[PDB]
């Protein structure tokens, strides 16, 4: 499934319909569905970002 996901996404939504002068994309693709999930997602994302920064600084 991973080896075909990219061509699947391009066949579903071509590049010219996503961004550009003729783009028709209005709804984004989100990893969350509620505001509470968004708050938890932002917290976890900030924690992971700081962890990767600390790992890069240690390296």
């Amino acid at each position: 499934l991973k080896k075909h996901q990219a061509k699947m996404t391009i066949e579903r939504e071509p590049f010219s319909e996503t961004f550009g002068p003729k783009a028709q994309r209005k709804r984004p693709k989100l990893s969350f569905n509620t505001v509470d999930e968004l708050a938890g997602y932002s917290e976890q994302s900030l924690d992971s970002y700081h962890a990767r920064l600390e790992e890069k600084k240690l390296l």
Partner: protein
């Protein structure tokens, strides 16, 4: 004054909807356009809700 095109109830409901995003942040509700309508001219129920 609701001249923005949306009801005060709708604005309050939007604030309550996005309130969980406001954790660990300071929140200030700014009543704009005071030259049109004042907070005292509002009905006491709406003043109570904003309180």
């Amino acid at each position: 004054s609701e001249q923005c095109g949306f009801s005060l109830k709708a604005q309050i409901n939007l604030f309550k909807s996005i309130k969980p995003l406001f954790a660990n942040k300071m929140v200030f509700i700014v009543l704009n356009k005071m030259d049109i309508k004042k907070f005292e001219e509002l009905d006491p129920e709406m003043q109570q809700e904003i309180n």
